[PDB]
């Protein structure tokens, strides 16, 4: 019973960690068939991936490097893949009966599009892109009720942890992003653990003057620039609060952010009897990715066993909302509901990039996001799926423009 | 619709905690029917329980307080309980079609008798008495293979924690003590957490001088004397290693004792992918008892929610086997198998009591147990149940007598 997987965004962080753990697990026994790989324009890296995994399908988004892919791939002996291009290629791969599970390792707003078509083809969607859930949660909910066989399985590390803490006999009576998921799983409350980021111990006056270099340099854990900035402001965690709400139907007043600087306990689930279950390991994306592909089973790995005695000490504290106002904004937008999460995510995209590029200061990030949120007005939510997606796109675009306008008016 | 339960050992620590949580769960809805209470001789406390819970059955092991009990219960208007005595009473209760689940809160080897009959009557046995498993593990496995609908559900805090950490989708396809339980549940390794007891930070020179008064006094968590002494020597953890092995079919080399002095993490399971799941709460027996009665579901309690930020710090270290040699003895007895665990438990019962009563020194505890284990000669294991039981009783008695002999020859 092999597991037939497509990897979307195969040359990125998530994509390469997916192939790493598949590679390593396949050495123990051959359980995975990599059936498709899809990237934007990393044609030389995609070639190299195809040489190893020999997927049936290859797809590159950017048509301008299509012919170069075809040329590179002729050098592979006895290998005749289907080489596809752009959105059309993505829809073709998602509609293959030969593919059961698709890892979505495509970043930013763009990740939502492939998520959508994987759901429409009733696949298991291993979704790392939290922005898709934040921006399009209710739409994704609606879609998952049309496509009863589709499932989103979380890959974001804390959400994977939460999922790993549940009893699958209860999970199988529902699915992620369903109303009443928490009630069916007897969930009371979530502890959503955080690294706390590089600024975790700075004073207000120090925060006033921090730069993106300070966020990016000497990192404990080397990550991409956008998520590093979001880790520094703790807007990552704020996005992850909304992600928790949508995935597991947990009320906002039942999600507690906790700073856990050792990053061993990945998050915790309090049940209605007050028992708490947690998922622990070294900081790690290979188990989250793997579990998304093996769920509801687990398979053997050769990962290093956790040495709790060596770890020795674990610590927990409450984040300061004054120092990390992005967290408060995320709760506020989440609780308001409607399209306020879309607006949060979009305005943060702009504010994050302004700070990265040294155009604004740390507290301007939250200032801009706050002002965009305040200017939005709740919109009647379309009952039609197509119109709902058009609303999300329009609101996303509006909010990014509004953020930029606020920046330019002050500047 | 109500869960029909008997409480065996109702006046003790486990029994009172079971009635406490049942009382709370029963405030609005009829969740549990307390069908039966059984004690040894605490007739005044049983009377008080009887007036509140009005069980169908009352049972007293000590026939000398029958008349006293009958006299007390007459003061309860319109109550006509069936009042039973001794082993006969116990067996009549276990045989009742009106009883679904039995809580075994009877201490010492004696707990084995009701455990055996509860299994022979295909009941759900919520078992707190670890000595039953250590003394008679293989026998209980054999009995559970015959009595297909009987189940042991663990109540010992660490074992409840481990059971909770498992995925009930897999648990439901096996049961505790069954061969292959660990394979079906994808268990790789157990972290068996301990408080470490009162003596955990003493030097070798200090530890030589410890007395039972030292172990019992200013207790961090107040417990009964026998368990307090076993916690002090870490023979409680030794017993719990063997308990783990039997309940979950985990090899001894895959059971790691960890001292976790804050006693929030109650134990952890490492699965074959190296993901670890843990259960945590304040020190608590109400959740383990309740869960044993509700499994595979959970119900609401009003226990104080865990405040992880208030706990703030969790620590983990390995125990010193030089300081806590009882651990090593338990591993050795468990690895040897046969009836060495029976001998361990029996000789401990004597050595514990000698220390409690100020007759021997701390290191004499381990010395006496070690000498009885070295003295014992492996016996072919009886093939029929009734003979196997007789063998266990004979060996338990022999090991107690041998420990006492060693004591008497020394002093
Ligand atoms: N990295 C991590 O550990 C974590 C990431 N996440 C989330 O997962 C998502 C992926 O992040 P990460 O892997 O870090 O991102 P990366 O930037 O490292 O990789 C993104 C991948 O998507 C590809 N891609 C971009 N646009 C398209 C497109 N239109 N069609 C097809 N492929 C496309 C890129 O191709 P190319 O190489 O050709 O540019 C690349 O392979 C993000 O939303 C992130 O927040 C969540 C938890 C942790
Ligand atoms: N207390 C705890 O929190 C924990 C307990 N356990 C285990 O649970 C078991 C019970 O412990 P605990 O509650 O502390 O013990 P207690 O000594 O507090 O209670 C023992 C109970 O058993 C009754 N009893 C004794 N002999 C008989 C008999 N022959 N027939 C019927 N009832 C009898 C006693 O009756 P009477 O009142 O008449 O004497 C009392 O109700 C032990 O094996 C212990 O290790 C494990 C985890 C922790
Ligand atoms: O959301 C995130 C990245 C940000 C969070 C994080 C940063 C650093 C450590 C752990 C978690 P933060 O809590 O700062 O928002 N993850 O899910 C990735 C976890 C991971 C895995 C392997 C190596 C490093 C990090
Ligand atoms: O085995 C035991 C008692 C000994 C272990 C213990 C002692 C103290 C705290 C936790 C655990 P130790 O690790 O010292 O052998 N339990 O299962 C009971 C746990 C519990 C619950 C509520 C209040 C107190 C204690
Ligand atoms: Ca009498
Ligand atoms: Ca569980
Ligand atoms: Ca092993
Ligand atoms: Mn995350
Ligand atoms: Mn215990």
Domains (range + CATH), chain B:
2-156 (3.40.50.720), 157-320 (no CATH), 321-411 (1.10.1740.10)
Question: Which has the closest alpha carbon to A99: A127, A81, A124, A126?
Answer: A124
Would you call A193 helix, strand, or coil by DSSP? strand
Which residues on chain A are in Cβ contact (under 8 Å) with B319? Answer: none
CA distance B199 to chain A (A): 19
d(CA B44, CA A65): 87
**Tokens 């915790």 belong to which residue?**
A268
> Which of A14, A158, A263 gets mutated to test ligand 3 (max ligand atoms within 8 A of its CB)?
A263
Question: Which has the closest alpha carbon to A159: A190, A188, A187, A138?
Answer: A190
Question: Which has the closest alpha carbon to B261: B240, B239, B277, B283?
Answer: B283
| Number of neighbouring beta carbons within 10 Å of residue B370 | 20
Report how far ligand 3's centroid is from the alpha carbon of A121 (Å): 31
> Which of A11, A14, A163, A240 gets mutated to test ligand 1 (max ligand atoms within 8 A of its CB)?
A14
Report how far ligand 8's centroid is from the alpha carbon of A333 (Å): 19
CA distance A317 to chain B (A): 4
What is the separation of C-alpha B337 from the centre of its chain, rounded to a whole number of angstroms? Answer: 20
- CB contacts < 8 A (A, B): 147
d(CA B110, CA B9): 11
Would you call A270 helix, strand, or coil by DSSP? strand
Which residues on chain B are in Cβ contact (under 8 Å) with A164? Answer: 275, 277
In terms of CA atoms, which chain B residue is nearest residue A287?
B275
Report how far ligand 6's centroid is from the alpha carbon of B161 (Å): 9
Ligand nearest to the CA of B197: 4
- Residues within 6 Å of ligand 4 by CB: B 156-158, 194-195, 197, 221, 223, 227, 231, 236-237, 263, 283-285
d(CA B288, CA B194): 16
- CA A161, A164, A166: angle at the middle one, nearest 5? 120
* Three-state SS sequence of chain B: CCEEEEEECCCCHHHHHHHHHHHHHCCCCCCEEEEEEEECCCHHHHHHHHHHHCCCEEEECCHHHHHHHHHHHCCCCCCCCEEEEHHHHHHHHHHCCCCCEEEECCCCCCHHHHHHHHHHCCCEEEECCHHHHHHHHHHHHHHHHHCCCCEEEECCHHHHHHHHHCCHHHHCCCCCCCCCHHHHCCEEEEEEEECCCCCCCCCHHHHCCCCHHHHHCCCCCCCCHHHHHHHHHCHHHHHHHHHHHHHHCCCHHHEEEEECCCCCEEEEEEECCCCEEEEECCCCCHHHHHHHHHCCCCCCCCCCCCCHHHHCEEECECCCCCCCHHHHHHHHHHHHCCCHHHHHHHHHHHHHHHHHCCCCCHHHHHHHHHHHHHHCCCCCCCCCHHHHHHHHHHHHHHHHHHHHHHHHHHC
Q: Which DSSP state fits A41?
A: S
Peptide bond into B296 cis (omega under 30): yes
| Token pair recorded at residue A253 | 């007043």
| Number of neighbouring beta carbons within 10 Å of residue B18 | 29
| Token pair recorded at residue B78 | 């319109």
- H/E segment holding residue A29: none
For residue A14, which atom of ligand 1 is closest to its CA?
A: 13
Question: Which has the closest alpha carbon to B154: B192, B121, B196?
Answer: B192
Which residues on chain A are in Cβ contact (under 8 Å) with B317? Answer: 309, 312
Best of A162, A183, A192, A308 to disrupt the B interface (most B CBs within 10 Å) is A308
d(CA B135, CA B333): 11
d(CA A53, CA A26): 11
Which residues on chain B are in Cβ contact (under 8 Å) with A303? Answer: 273-274
For residue A20, say whether it is annotated as part of any ligand binding site. Answer: no
For residue A312, say whether it is annotated as part of any ligand binding site. Answer: no
Instruction: Find the CB nearest B281 among A164, A171, A274.
Output: A274
| Token pair recorded at residue A53 | 């995994």
d(CA A108, CA A166): 29
Ligand nearest to the CA of B64: 5
| Token pair recorded at residue B249 | 């079919």
Ligand nearest to the CA of B249: 7
Q: Whose CA is nearest to atom 44 of ligand 2?
A: B129
CA distance B320 to chain A (A): 12
Question: Which has the closest alpha carbon to A249: A305, A148, A171, A330?
Answer: A171
Instruction: Find the CB nearest B191 among A278, A296, A308.
Output: A308
> Which of B195, B267, B319 gets mutated to test ligand 4 (max ligand atoms within 8 A of its CB)?
B195
Query: Residue A187: beta bridge partners?
Result: A271
Report how far ligand 7's centroid is from the alpha carbon of A368 (Å): 55
| Number of neighbouring beta carbons within 10 Å of residue A38 | 29
Which residues on chain A are in Cβ contact (under 8 Å) with B291? Answer: 273, 275
With DSSP H G I counted as helix, E B as strand and the rest as coil, what are the percentages for chain A, rounded to 5? 50, 15, 35
User: Max Cα separation, chain A?
Assistant: 63
For residue A111, which atom of ligand 1 is closest to its CA?
A: 43
| Token pair recorded at residue B46 | 């049983």
Peptide bond into A65 cis (omega under 30): no
Question: Which has the closest alpha carbon to B189: B278, B262, B280, B261?
Answer: B278
Put the strands of the sheet holding A32-39 in their side by side order: A82-85, A57-60, A32-39, A3-8, A101-104, A124-127, A151-154
Report how far ligand 3's centroid is from the alpha carbon of A214 (Å): 17
Report how far ligand 9's centroid is from the alpha carbon of B201 (Å): 20
For residue A236, which atom of ligand 3 is closest to its CA?
A: 15
CA distance A296 to chain B (A): 9
| Token pair recorded at residue B57 | 């059955």
Task: Note whether A322 and A199 are within 8 A (CB).
Answer: no
| Token pair recorded at residue B201 | 């930070």
Query: Residue B1: beta bridge partners?
Result: none
> How would you classify the pairing of strands A265-271 and A187-194?
antiparallel
Question: Which has the closest alpha carbon to A300: A33, A34, A28?
Answer: A28
User: Are A273 and B309 an interchain contact pair (Cβ–Cβ within 8 Å)?
Assistant: no
d(CA B227, CA A43): 66
- H/E segment holding residue A222: none
Report how far ligand 6's centroid is from the alpha carbon of A343 (Å): 37
What is the separation of C-alpha B166 from the centre of its chain, rounded to a whole number of angstroms? Answer: 20
User: Are B315 and A312 an interchain contact pair (Cβ–Cβ within 8 Å)?
Assistant: yes
| Number of neighbouring beta carbons within 10 Å of residue B411 | 8
- Determination technique for this entry: X-ray
Task: Note whether A391 and A380 are within 8 A (CB).
Answer: no
User: Are A164 and B275 an interchain contact pair (Cβ–Cβ within 8 Å)?
Assistant: yes
Question: Which has the closest alpha carbon to B295: B132, B124, B59?
Answer: B124
Binding-site annotation: residue ranges of B: 11-14, 40-42, 130-131, 156-158, 195, 218, 224, 231, 236-237, 240
For residue A367, say whether it is annotated as part of any ligand binding site. Answer: no
Q: Is the CB of B9 under 6 A from ligand 2?
A: yes
Which residues on chain B are in Cβ contact (under 8 Å) with A273? Answer: 287, 290-291, 294, 298-301, 303
- CA A329, A247, A332: angle at the middle one, nearest 5? 15
CA distance A338 to chain B (A): 31
Query: Residue B102: beta bridge partners?
Result: B6, B125
Within chain A, how many helices (H) and strands (E) appear?
19, 12
């Amino acid at each position: 019973k092999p597991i037939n997987v497509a990897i979307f965004g195969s040359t990125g962080s998530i994509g390469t960690n997916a192939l790493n753990i598949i590679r390593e697990c396949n050495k123990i026994e051959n359980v995975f068939n990599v059936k498709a790989l899809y990237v934007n324009k990393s044609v030389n890296e995609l070639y190299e991936q195809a040489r190893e995994f020999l997927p049936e399908y290859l797809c590159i988004h950017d048509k301008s490097v299509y012919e170069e892919l075809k040329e590179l791939v002729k050098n592979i002996k006895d290998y005749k893949p289907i080489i596809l291009c752009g959105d059309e290629g993505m829809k073709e791969i998602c509609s293959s009966n030969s593919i059961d599970k698709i890892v979505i390792g495509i970043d930013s707003f763009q990740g939502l599009y492939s998520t959508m078509y994987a759901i429409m083809n009733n696949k298991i969607v291993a979704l790392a892109n939290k922005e898709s859930i934040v921006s399009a949660g209710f739409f994704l909910k609606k879609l998952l009720n049309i496509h009863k066989n589709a499932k989103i399985i979380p890959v974001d590390s804390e959400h994977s942890a939460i999922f790993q803490c549940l009893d699958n006999n209860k999970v199988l009576k529902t699915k992620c992003l369903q109303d009443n998921f928490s009630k069916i799983n007897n969930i009371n409350k979530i502890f959503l653990c955080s690294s706390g980021g590089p600024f975790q111990n700075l004073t207000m006056d120090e925060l006033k003057n921090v730069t993106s270099e300070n966020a990016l340099k000497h990192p404990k854990w080397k990550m991409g620039k956008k998520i590093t900035i979001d880790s520094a402001t703790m807007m990552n965690k704020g996005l992850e609060v909304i992600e928790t709400h949508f995935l597991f139907d947990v009320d906002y007043n039942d999600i507690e952010v906790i700073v856990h600087k050792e990053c061993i306990i990945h998050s915790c689930v309090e049940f209605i009897d007050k028992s708490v279950i947690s998922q622990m390991y070294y900081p790690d994306m290979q188990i989250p990715i793997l579990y998304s592909l093996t769920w509801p089973d687990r398979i053997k790995t050769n990962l290093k066993p956790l040495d709790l005695a060596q770890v020795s000490t674990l610590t927990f504290h409450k984040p300061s909302l004054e120092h990390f106002p992005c967290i408060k904004l995320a709760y506020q937008a989440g609780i308001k509901g409607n399209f306020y999460p879309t607006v949060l995510n979009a305005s943060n995209e702009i504010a994050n990039n302004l700070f990265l590029n040294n155009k604004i200061k740390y507290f301007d990030i939250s200032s801009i996001i706050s002002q965009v949120l305040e200017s939005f007005n709740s919109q009647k939510v379309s009952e039609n799926s197509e119109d709902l997606m058009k609303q999300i796109l329009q609101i996303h675009s509006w909010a990014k423009d509004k953020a930029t306008d606020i920046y330019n008016k002050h500047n």
